[PDB]
Amino acid sequence: GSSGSSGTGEKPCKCTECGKAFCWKSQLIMHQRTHVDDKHSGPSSG
Q: Which residues bind Zn ion (CB under 5 A)?
A: 15, 17-18, 20
Instruction: Report the nearest approach of Zn ion to the CB of residue 27 (Å).
Output: 11
Q: Is the CB of 13 or the CB of 15 nearer to Zn ion?
A: 15
Report the distance separating Cα 23 and Cα 41, nearest Å: 29
Instruction: Report the nearest approach of Zn ion to the CB of residue 3 (Å).
Output: 23
In this structure, the chain runs to a length of 46
Report the distance separating Cα 8 and Cα 42, nearest Å: 33
Instruction: Report the nearest approach of Zn ion to the CB of residue 41 (Å).
Output: 18
